[PDB]
UniProtKB/Swiss-Prot annotation, chain B:
This is Spindle assembly abnormal protein 6. The coiled coil domain is necessary and sufficient for interaction with sas-5. It comes from Caenorhabditis elegans. The gene is sas-6. The chain holds residues 2 to 198 of 492 of the full protein. It is found in: Cytoplasm; Cytoplasm, Cytoskeleton, Microtubule organizing center, Centrosome, Centriole. Disruption phenotype: RNAi-mediated knockdown results in failed centrosome duplication in embryos.
Length: 151, 165
């Protein structure tokens, strides 16, 4: 009930009235009524902005930026823009950090932010499953260094 | 702030919970649960119970008692002790080796019953039980971020075998 169309880490310019280039993960997906844009940062856990486009909402966005392209072919076109070297991504935040212009994205809070943070916690958890014998194995090799320092 | 910690420690608790929403029968295992009892003010005095688990990030239950809410709990568990003394009595029970903590979760993990049971002979046994609710929103966000930022300092201490050689 959610299909990823694009999921990748880009270099974006981040303005907030300071400006700095940062790595931003952009995820474009397709889902049922019941198109979604999600941006997040690996260096900032709380930073999370989204927007969900429906046919009606899209018609306004298509009028504003003079897009003749329909709702089904719009993600296909943006996906191709994201591939081009000449494409720039600029993200400008408001004073209250409630919104950001990428399309106007809103700050993701509550349950969606909880899902995001849990995914980080559980990914950072597999970090302890691989790295647990690290400090212990370092002793056997560091002892081998001093014993080989003589030769 | 107004919030004062009266008890903040890791205990061994018995955790009973249904196997799932479609299997009511219980599964039980002893686990390490961090219990925090704190005094605060909201408008008079309030007492807050918070439980969490280091092995389960989403596991976060609380309850805030006020004078009125406490009178019901005391009536229910036949506590003659007043609201100011109630945490003092709980803390003395938690000092005793014969004290048992039992946490029974519902199938949906929405609530849980936290029980303090004294195995000392002559005791009433069940000292009390308080119904704790699953913490969501901003408080859970603060909790989950603290874990993320704690697991982050894990990368600051981590040059990967110092280039092996």
């Amino acid at each position: 009930s959610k299909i990823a169309l694009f999921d990748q880490t880009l270099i974006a310019s981040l303005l907030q009235p300071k400006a700095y280039k940062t790595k931003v993960k952009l995820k474009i997906s397709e889902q049922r009524n019941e198109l979604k844009f999600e941006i997040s940062r690996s260096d900032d856990f709380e930073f999370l902005f989204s927007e969900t486009l429906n046919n009606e909402k899209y018609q306004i966005l298509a009028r504003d930026h003079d897009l003749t392209v329909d709702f089904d072919a719009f993600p296909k076109v943006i996906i191709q823009h994201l591939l081009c070297k000449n494409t720039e991504i600029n993200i400008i935040l408001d004073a209250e950090k409630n919104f950001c212009s990428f399309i106007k994205l809103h700050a993701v809070r509550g349950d969606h932010l909880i899902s995001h943070l849990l995914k980080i916690c559980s990914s950072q958890a597999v970090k302890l499953s691989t790295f647990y014998k690290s400090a212990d194995e370092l002793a056997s090799l560091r002892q081998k260094c001093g014993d080989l320092e003589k030769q």
